[PDB]
């Protein structure tokens, strides 16, 4: 695990573009790094997952919209999305699995009109 | 070097090569293997500390039995040097690095 | 005639028989599976530095399927076979790019000089092509790799000399060059690391010029020259250390020299800071500087940064700080390993580095002598209550200051046990008012102490008393943090073991052929062969015996009295 700083907090109209980023601090070479979204009174599900092999996987709904590329320069993860919708407004968080030990740095609020 | 006959390693009571394996049992007290080397040539020895052994040191009969047994050189292995010093009371034997069963598995 | 060399069996004979059993004729490769696959996987889970047996190597040779399946089974299977003829190297290198990408942590095992294979270094460089911020912390081991980077270099040197025969004078190395040219800070780190290796290896001096040629942008080169003036500054400090005078006279002379140096600091433009590559220095306060009373004649100066804040710095010359510097970097890396466990031992990662061959610099800290804190303050309680006195309305308890102090104590104990740092005494140990326990003079380590070899724990009678009265709470808590740090360490210990293997493979101060036995001893203090954690409990029992002897024998009581007298 490790301590990371990621802020996706903000509000925008439907169809807009909001970039998300996560900058980790701790031991590098994580097993996997990914991001997910969840709303109050509900459950969290797997959205985007980027492995250490360079391979990535996305959900069914955010497919083609939310894509996550891993920048190895600063060892920072970059998740960029487009065409956000009404039901897509919720609290998003980024999780990184390292050596079997999961790490959740923080979470932020994303609002869509 | 401040004093002679000493050693770098904790358990090591005298001049020798680097560390090695060891064992222990519910039947008897723990023991540790040791290796004394002549610049790349070593034998198979056993670690014993004479410094703390001055309280008892009843090694007489054991030394007589060791002299009698290792004196003869039969098909069975004979001890190289069994002795006690002012620092190390460690024992010694010829280099083998092969157990009976371990070699039985190693040499099909 | 003949030669006997290194009534006995030998190594090469076993090689002969084992190699005679290595037939593997019918080429059909089955893909069977059974419950023994788990046991084999466990057999492949052994430490990187271990030497596998015969049957195990063959079992790993027929395990190629699962070996490709598991990412942790890669390096082990790579060491499970010996590549000499092109026959084995064929299937090996063919499966090199075929197998799943290994973890970068386990990649440090096959990145050592133990495996000189071209395909190995290639594929590893391809895996190491991604350079994180932890690569900058891995630069210390990368200097070791650079020292070990030369194998049959006559061909490469002749290749360079072929293109150097035209104009008169006036490989993962390409990846290191690209990484150096990428970020100017990383390049400065590479140059600073090359400054130390320039003394030991003469090729490093020209390799620094090759590094300057590796970086096209000269923007960093200017600040590198401004930082190259620091060599002349250290030469000025040595010039101040050349003349012998009175303590006060040398102090006033050091003040005048600090003023003359303050003139140059304002004259020359801002440069890169020794503490961090990101921060930039502006000037230095002449009257805020100090001078060490030690024999090394170290210089302490407070320099105002570009952030408009004073920064204390302590530098020394005429000695090799590479030992304590590498130990400090290891302490920082271990601190990162602890931070990865989401738990902080509150250990201060003191910045230490070597400027020139004889010269070195370090970030200064509020450190006081143990004997001074004992004599003047009369106990550590008052000294800790000096900065932030805490009297609770109930137990008179103390806060996160004392908490961090205890955590630093236990952490330093675990570090002293693990690393086996020697030459640590009341003088070598310092106290930091920030609530941290400072430890210096790491020159002697890996089982090397000035006096006869003592126990693993560096804890004295004083801290044992302070934690002794509070034992009902403090000892249980310190034991909890102990065991936790043990699990955390021993979990990721493999990568550190491989890194230490490469680093020791390069070269070491205070250690030479220690290295094999040193690696061994690291494993023993780590007790990797034991799945039982009871060793830490035994060490705790020893700490319990530190206050009062068990008195099993007269020589045992004399031994406890000896340890007490040594302290």
Mapped to the 3 state alphabet, what secondary structure does C337-361 carry? HHHCCCCCCCCCCCCEECCCCCCEE
Q: Which residues contact C65 (CB under 8 A, 6 or more apart)?
A: C31
d(CA C138, CA C239): 35
C521 interface with B at CB cutoff 8 Å? yes
| Dihedral (Cα; C402, C408, C414, C416), 10-degree rounding | -120
**3 state SS for chain B:** CCCCCCCCCCCCCCCCCCCCCEECCCCCCCEEEECCCCCCCCCEEECCCCCCHHHCCCCHHHHHHHHHHHHCCCCCCCEEEECCCCCCCCEEECCCCCCHHHHHHHCC
Separation in Å, CA of B60 to nearest CA in chain C: 20
User: Residue C263: in which H helix or E strand, if any?
Assistant: helix C247-267
- If one counts every other C-beta atom within 10 angstroms of the C-beta of residue A4, the result is 21
Residue pointed to by tokens 């050349």: C242
Helix (H, G, I), strand (E, B) or coil at C564: helix
Give me the half-sphere count of Cα atoms (radius 13 Å) on the Cβ side of residue C501. Answer: 22
- Contact call for residues B35 and B42 (beta carbons, < 8 A): yes
Contact C134 A72 (CB under 8 A): no
Separation in Å, CA of A76 to nearest CA in chain C: 9
Helix (H, G, I), strand (E, B) or coil at C201: coil
* DSSP letters for C48-59: TT----HHHHHH
d(CA B23, CA C542): 20
Residues of C in Cβ contact (< 8 Å) with B18 = 516-517, 520
CA B60 from chain centre, in angstroms, equals: 17
Token pair of C165 as six digits: 């025969």
Across-strand partners of A11? A111
Contact C339 A27 (CB under 8 A): yes
- If one counts every other C-beta atom within 10 angstroms of the C-beta of residue C301, the result is 23
C559 interface with B at CB cutoff 8 Å? yes
Q: Are chains C and B touching, using the cut-off of 8 Å on CB pairs and a minimum of 3 such pairs?
A: yes
- Contact call for residues C301 and C240 (beta carbons, < 8 A): no
d(CA C465, CA C449): 24
Q: Of C349, C317, C310, which is closest to residue C331 (Cα–Cα)?
A: C349
Token pair of B12 as six digits: 């090591």
d(CA C113, CA C172): 13
Separation in Å, CA of C412 to nearest CA in chain B: 20
Could you list the beta-strand ranges (E) of chain A: 3-6, 10-12, 19-25, 32-38, 48-51, 56-58, 67-71, 76-80, 90-98, 101-112
Burial C431-449 (b: 16+ CB within 10 A, else e): bbbbbbbbbbbbbbbbbbb
d(CA C485, CA C419): 14
- Contact call for residues A90 and A24 (beta carbons, < 8 A): no
C278 interface with A at CB cutoff 8 Å? no
Q: Which residues contact B1 (CB under 8 A, 6 or more apart)?
A: none
Burial class of A47 by CB neighbour count within 10 A (0 to 12, 13 to 18, 19+): buried
Token pair of C554 as six digits: 């007269």
C-alpha torsion sign, points C243, C247, C248, C251? positive
Phi, psi of C203 (to 5 degrees): -70, -20
d(CA A95, CA A38): 13
Chain C residue closest in CA terms to B20: C520
Distance between start and end Cα atoms, chain B: 48
Cα angle value A42/A47/A50 (rounded, 5°): 145
Please enumerate, by residue number, every residue of B annotated as part of a binding site: 24-32, 45
Chain C residue closest in CA terms to B97: C9
Chain B residue closest in CA terms to C515: B18
Q: Mutate which of C517, C529, C535, C561 to disrupt the B interface (most B C-beta within 10 Å)?
A: C517
The shortest CB-CB distance from C336 to any of A26, A99, A103 is to: A26
C-alpha torsion sign, points B57, B60, B63, B65? negative
Contact B8 C453 (CB under 8 A): yes
Q: Mutate which of C124, C128, C133, C136 to disrupt the A interface (most A C-beta within 10 Å)?
A: C133
C-alpha torsion sign, points B97, B101, B103, B105? negative
d(CA B12, CA A25): 43
Resolution stated for this PDB structure, in Å? 4.4
d(CA C540, CA C536): 6
Token pair of C297 as six digits: 């004649």
**Experimental determination technique:** X-ray
Q: After which residues is chain A broken (C to N over 2.5 A)?
A: none
d(CA C134, CA C556): 47
Burial class of B91 by CB neighbour count within 10 A (0 to 12, 13 to 18, 19+): buried
Cα angle value C384/C387/C392 (rounded, 5°): 65
Contact A3 C134 (CB under 8 A): no
Instruction: Give me Rg for the CA atoms of chain B.
Output: 15
C18 interface with B at CB cutoff 8 Å? no
C344 interface with A at CB cutoff 8 Å? no
Across-strand partners of A5? A23
Distance between start and end Cα atoms, chain C: 58
d(CA C72, CA C489): 18
CA C525 from chain centre, in angstroms, equals: 17
- Contact call for residues C351 and C335 (beta carbons, < 8 A): no
CA C406 from chain centre, in angstroms, equals: 24
Helix (H, G, I), strand (E, B) or coil at C427: coil
Q: Of C234, C237, C235, which is closest to residue C250 (Cα–Cα)?
A: C237
User: Residue C298: in which H helix or E strand, if any?
Assistant: none
CA C365 from chain centre, in angstroms, equals: 20
Chain C residue closest in CA terms to B5: C452
Q: Are chains C and A touching, using the cut-off of 8 Å on CB pairs and a minimum of 3 such pairs?
A: yes
Separation in Å, CA of C519 to nearest CA in chain B: 11
d(CA C141, CA C474): 37
Helix (H, G, I), strand (E, B) or coil at C397: coil
C-alpha torsion sign, points B48, B54, B59, B63? positive
The shortest CB-CB distance from C340 to any of A1, A53, A72 is to: A1
Could you list the beta-strand ranges (E) of C279-366: 280-281, 285-291, 299-304, 310-316, 352-353, 360-363
Cα angle value C530/C534/C535 (rounded, 5°): 70
Strand A10-12 to A101-112 pairing: parallel
- If one counts every other C-beta atom within 10 angstroms of the C-beta of residue B25, the result is 8
Separation in Å, CA of B5 to nearest CA in chain C: 12
Residues of B in Cβ contact (< 8 Å) with C16 = none
Contact B40 C6 (CB under 8 A): yes
Give me the half-sphere count of Cα atoms (radius 13 Å) on the Cβ side of residue C431. Answer: 23
d(CA C254, CA C237): 9
Across-strand partners of C299? C291, C315
């Amino acid at each position: 695990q490790v301590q990371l700083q990621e802020s996706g907090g903000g509000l925008v109209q439907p169809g807009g573009s909001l970039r998300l980023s996560c900058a980790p601090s701790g031991p590098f070479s994580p097993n996997s790094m990914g991001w997910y979204r969840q709303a109050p009174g509900k459950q969290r599900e797997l959205v985007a997952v980027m492995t250490i092999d360079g391979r990535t996987n996305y959900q069914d709904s955010v497919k083609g919209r939310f894509t996550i590329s891993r920048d190895y320069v600063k060892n920072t993860a970059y998740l960029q999305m487009n065409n956000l919708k009404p039901d897509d407004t919720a609290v998003y968080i980024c999780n990184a699995e390292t050596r079997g030990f999961m790490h959740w740095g923080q979470g932020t609020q994303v609002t869509v009109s | 070097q401040a004093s002679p006959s000493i050693a770098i390693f904790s358990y090591i009571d005298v001049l020798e090569e680097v560390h090695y394996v060891s064992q222990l049992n519910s039947s008897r007290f723990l023991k540790t293997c040791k290796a004394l080397d002549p610049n790349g040539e070593i034998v198979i020895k056993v670690f014993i500390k004479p410094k703390d052994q001055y309280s008892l040191r009843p090694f007489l009969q054991r030394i007589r039995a060791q002299s009698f047994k290792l004196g003869q050189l039969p098909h069975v292995l004979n001890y190289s040097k069994l002795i006690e010093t002012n620092r190390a009371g460690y024992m010694i034997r010829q280099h083998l690095k092969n157990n009976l069963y371990d070699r039985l598995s190693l040499r099909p | 005639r003949e030669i006997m060399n290194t009534n006995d069996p030998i190594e090469e004979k076993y090689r002969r028989l084992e190699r005679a059993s290595k037939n593997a004729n019918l080429d059909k490769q089955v893909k069977p599976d059974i419950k023994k696959r788990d046991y084999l996987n466990k057999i492949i889970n052994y430490p990187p530095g271990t030497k596998l047996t015969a049957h195990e190597k063959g079992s790993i040779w027929k395990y190629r399927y699962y070996l490709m399946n598991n990412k942790k089974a890669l390096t082990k299977l790579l060491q499970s076979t010996n590549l000499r003829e092109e026959s084995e190297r064929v299937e090996v290198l063919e499966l090199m790019d075929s197998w799943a990408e290994i973890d970068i942590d386990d990649a440090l095992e096959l990145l050592g000089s133990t495996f000189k294979n071209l395909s190995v270094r290639s594929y590893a460089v391809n895996r190491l092509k991604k350079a994180s911020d932890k690569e900058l912390e891995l630069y210390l081991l990368q200097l070791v790799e650079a020292v070990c980077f030369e194998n049959l270099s006559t061909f490469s040197d002749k290749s360079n000399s072929e293109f150097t025969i035209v104009d008169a004078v006036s490989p993962l190395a390409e990846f290191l060059i690209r990484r150096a040219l990428v970020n100017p800070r990383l390049g400065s780190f590479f140059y600073w690391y090359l400054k130390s290796e320039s003394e030991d290896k003469p090729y490093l001096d020209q390799i620094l010029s090759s590094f300057w040629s590796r970086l096209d942008k000269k923007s960093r080169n200017i600040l590198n020259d401004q930082v190259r003036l620091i060599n002349v500054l250290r030469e000025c400090c040595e010039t101040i250390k050349r003349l012998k005078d009175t303590t006060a006279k040398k102090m006033e002379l050091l003040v005048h020299l600090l003023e003359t140096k303050v003139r140059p600091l304002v004259k020359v433009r801002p440069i890169a800071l020794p503490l961090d590559p990101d921060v930039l220095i502006c000037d230095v306060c002449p009257e805020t500087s100090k001078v060490f009373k030690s024999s090394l004649s170290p210089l302490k100066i407070t320099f105002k940064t570009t952030l408009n804040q004073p920064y204390h710095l302590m530098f020394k010359v005429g000695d090799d700080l590479r030992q304590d510097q590498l130990v400090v970097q290891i302490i920082s890396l271990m601190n990162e390993l602890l931070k990865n466990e989401n738990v902080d031992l509150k250990l201060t990662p003191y910045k230490i580095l070597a400027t020139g061959p004889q010269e070195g610099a370090i970030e200064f800290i509020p450190n006081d002598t143990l004997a001074s804190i004992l004599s003047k303050y009369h106990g550590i309680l008052g000294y800790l209550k000096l900065h932030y006195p805490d009297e609770n309305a109930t137990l008179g308890v103390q806060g996160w200051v004392l908490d961090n102090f205890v955590k630093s104590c236990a952490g330093y104990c675990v570090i002293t046990y693990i690393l086996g740092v020697g030459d640590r005494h009341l003088d070598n140990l310092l106290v930091t008012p920030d609530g941290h326990f400072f430890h210096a003079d790491f020159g002697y380590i890996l089982g090397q102490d000035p006096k006869p070899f003592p126990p693993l724990m560096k804890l004295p009678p004083q801290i044992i008393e302070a934690f002794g009265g509070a034992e009902s709470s403090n000892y249980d808590k310190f034991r909890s943090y102990c065991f936790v740090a043990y699990s955390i360490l021993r979990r990721n210990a493999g990568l550190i073991l491989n890194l230490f293997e490469l680093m020791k493979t390069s070269n070491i101060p205070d250690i030479r052929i220690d290295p094999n036995g040193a690696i061994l001893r690291v494993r023993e203090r780590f007790n990797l062969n034991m799945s039982e954690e009871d060793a830490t409990v035994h060490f705790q029992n020893l700490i319990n015996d530190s206050v009062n002897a068990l008195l099993p024998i007269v020589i045992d009581h004399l031994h406890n009295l000896a340890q007490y007298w040594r302290t």
